[PDB]
């Protein structure tokens, strides 16, 4: 894998710590540039806890490097993404995923 | 890209996209929650909610998007709730006690003239909740392989927001319809109303609407009738026929709600009334006991009541509708009067008790349906059917309650959680009726059956289960799978094995359950044509369990069913097993392993509670002799080698590989042909011996009994039985410094084979001469008793052969010696 | 030990007591209640309205609601299909329509004629709206499968044909001759062959079942919940033969001939001979049952009931044959003369002679002797 | 070539229909009389019931159907009273034999033998056959009497049409096999002439024959037409015209285009190749449409159909055939495979955005209210993710 590119700066100090609950908005796109998911479409932040392996390794490793309030683009290789299997009907096999992630707050 | 609104003029793209929406609905149709979750990525919630309000969409696309929303997010939940909505399991709680037929008002003191608003109020009938899962496409994939993970839940969509939006759209549609504009939303009144009404009906049936929401819907339907203490309602807007069909669906929902209210009110009254009756009877019994020998005849004359079953006590106590004296019915007058008043109230609520404005749901529905039929020659057969079904329900108010009560059941509070869990499992099983069986469906079915079996309520409330019709559902699933690919091997043998374990315990649960399953004997016998691939339990096992140890059922058994089983046995005795032939077993010309199952069923049909059923026994004997091929090749007319020779040949086969099996293994080679032949002949002899007449009948000298005994003697010679009983068995022996040389029970001559012959000898020929008794002891019995005794050492004590010998002795041989 | 053992209701758990109360109350109070809504419903559905305000100049006045209902059921019957699916709506509305035609000191001649006119009007409300054609279509559609659908259809047919309604007879005959369908008589023949007779094996099985008595509390257990297994469909057989008789009642020569030979149809079925065949089967069953009871000095209650059922069915069949032949229909007379009717008459004469001589000697069976 | 007594559903098929042909042309439609000689013709095959000295009772070809061998008569009893002869009457004559009522014994006039059933031999009962071979015997049995039942004009016409169509299409297939593998080079087609005109006209007539009833008819008439259509479809399928059409399609499929066909049959014949293949597919669709049995016949060979979807000469016709099969038969849906679904999707990919392909995919998911999860998952996984 995951490579993070800043879009808007955060506070730069408070980073997620293992066991904390991160609240985010995200917009998922295939490497081609086809949208396949967005929490903003459902108008409800996505919450997940680090270390519980609830989200793919790409998120696990990428969101950890973002400060609270930061917006960033995560580019995740297939191996860190769903990989060879591919989330059937959504993600083709061996697909690189590009996400536009804003880390709203920690809790 | 273009604006999707350009599809109003780009017709080819419009057609293709509408059929694409149809395909989206099809790929998630009938409970494919995983595909629904996938589609939530392609048509997201924002798009769906925007299309719902987009007033410029072409009609086809508007309808397609409404249907897509329903299919993705609401269809499965609505269908499960609809399936559960036809049963009334009322928990006896304070909320139930608070339910009354009429609102606690004062319009009329008895049976208040005004009903309450239908669908508004308290309902206590148990309906399992809805379960949804958030649509997220960044979660880690469950590493659990397929056919192991829990079934996916329908993707979630904000229900309160959807509810508000649906009501708002319906209100806007009503106002626009009133205005009569020239650009209807979607292009026509049909495309403006039908989608919104479908959404609202789905949401109602799901039961997510609140009381205020339902009141608003009712006021939209008919402002005057459903007022609470635009003036043009939906029912008077000169609407097309499809919109009329949706209105009929709404009215159907509200009529069902009134029926549910009636049932719940009846149960709530029944609780209090039966409590009062019980208190009355306890007091009466106390007085009766206190009465010190006032008159012994009088004491008996009262106490028979308490000697009778509770159902008849209830009937006697309630048998006072047309009047009765204290002797006929001891209920006090006040207790009687409570029931009389409630009966009056119930009749008034149903409308029995006997305006230009309806002023009630019943009058509204009747007048509306008649007005529609008078106004137009309705062309839609579905609309006609719905209209007249509604009209019939409105006119026959009491009949509807009468036909609905059989599915009403009251439970205690302590059973609510278990009943809810069982309803969840039953909902899963019912949902499996509309999908073609696959591996995941098989696993879900098995898990549901297991949970139902481990559920306490399944055992404590068999009447509830018959009312729910669980046996019918499980049988239907089993038969669907059996018929599917019946010519070839039956897939999902594990599922069919579970199909007994459930149904085929269910027969054992209670005698009424056994009656219910017996009513489908021919169905099970019809579907039991091919089996034995399962190696588990079969519909033939279900059939046997449905009659086992029940004289009343065995006497109701039918000759045509016996003929079906006999014909199957004849086929088994004439043609080799295709499955074994495919596996590579040598062709022997007949099917002992299937013949054995058919003979076992006939045995259970003819022998009940240790006594032969003559009616079935005579029929079975006659059928078997009329189809001699059932007796097997050994007992054939000309080429028959005799039972003893057949058993010896079977033993030689068992000792000879390449003639007992494929010669090339979940049960260690499955079937060994030698053991199969021995088992078939043992089962046949057991069946005949059990068909033998009873000793008391023979002593009475009944001609039929003597004739049947003569026929059985002709079929089986005594010398053959003695020879088989004299045949030697393999005894476990120690060798090679600790090697227990145990015979393979599943592939050799076992004591049960001799036990069958002993049964036949005892019941048909009988031991009556001391010389014969001594001869049998010397040749057949005593050697086996000596072997069993010699196997008493510590090493061989628990061997399979030793235990089999012990059972054989203590169940067949020693009792015979005791008798003689 | 049940005699000493008590099972008071006041010890039963509350929920179980509630379920028992619901079952009882349903059977004793709700079920007994009699509501007569059929006449009101049919009148409401027959009344048309506002035809004057719309002043439809199309002489084909739109069918009124009852007509539309009948047309819908005719549509369902005429739909091409492998079998007739059981339809609770059709059964309910057929029952309502049948009950609409009521057919209810010394009542005066004017009173009798007035009741007759009411019955004619009630039957007109239906057969002026296609009820006769619907009945024939449903009988053809059942394809000879016994069931509630055909039972309701036959009862409706009898209801609209009662009194030998000549108009209904003419409508039915015209429909049959115009459509030239073999399905109707094939279905009738199949049903008549499926009609049952006295079965002594079933009788003996029922006797043994009754002799068995549940040890545990009967009411709490199945309580020998066994229905009549001997001629369980006597009501259906009587309805079928009553329908056939009503077709020919009044010396309707046209039906009397049609029931023997359907000239237009590709294949004909002789319903006269089918009736004779059923009568022969019934006679043989009755003779067997008599031979069973010949030795016994007296006949027990279930035997008497079975005799009464068989004898009512035989009486109905004899009435149907008489209605076939009277007028006289010479064709039917010849057909019966060349049939197995004589053998049935011989067997019936034997049974009559011996049963009379026996039943006379006792007084507890005067009713059975009268029916014989 | 053999005659049996069969009692299954053949009593409603076309291979149990026989035509009675008196030994005279004028007044051959007169009332049939007892003892009148006549031939008995099998309508569908056109063969005449007869007695060959070497094989007994058979059906012989018309060329070998001389009067001595193929003359039979109906008698009211087996008594030997045929001594009295009969004289031809120039008129309808007296009505003697009745449909259904009269019971007739068939007798071979030349030999005098009686039409009867052979004694069922063993192992045939064991197989379970309900068919008893018929034979001519000196004495026969007592229940040899036969009853004559009229068949409706519909079945009569269908049987004659089956006879003629079978002849024509077999001639066509033989013609194609004549030059199956013989390149014409630059000269004669090198084979038998093809009945191109007759085949085209026959195909058009049969398509009109099997045309479904119009949706604008009243309900009762539509139902009667549907029943007639189902009956005629079943008759043709049971006589095997479906297999004949499939064989013709197979022979014509070897050639990828009209020019390739011309390289073996000549330009004149190739001028009709596309028309003939399209007509054949239309006839197949007409034969199977709405008929569950005929549609379910494709379960054994679905690949035969799916593999042809990409053919460019009759794309719409093949797609229509597939649509009918999938709409009517759940058995096919239970055997659909991933390769089949991929081919159907490749139709979308290669032929354009046609909504009938979407309809086919929809029909693959649900049939008669039952869903096929495997098909649903395969369609989703192979169509949606690509976007």
Author numbering:
A (entry chain E): 2 to 108
B (entry chain A): 1648 to 1876, 1923 to 2047, 2089 to 2398, 2411 to 2566
C (entry chain A): 3634 to 3737, 3752 to 4019
D (entry chain A): 244 to 630
What does the original paper state about this entry?
RyR1 is the primary Ca2+ release channel of the sarcoplasmic reticulum (SR) in skeletal muscle, where SR Ca2+ release plays a crucial role in triggering muscle contractions. Using cryogenic electron microscopy (cryo-EM), previous structural studies revealed the homotetrameric architecture of the 2.3 MDa RyR1 channels exhibiting a mushroom-like shape that consists of a huge cytosolic shell (head) and a C-terminal pore region (stalk) spanning the SR membrane. While the cytosolic shell is mainly formed by a large α-solenoid network interspersed with globular domains, the transmembrane domain (TMD) possesses a 6-transmembrane-helix architecture (helices S1–S6) typical for cation channels, including a pseudo-voltage sensor domain (pVSD) (S1–S4) and the inner pore (S5–S6). To solve the structure of simvastatin binding sites on RyR1, we chromatographically purified endogenous RyR1 channels from mouse skeletal muscle tissues.
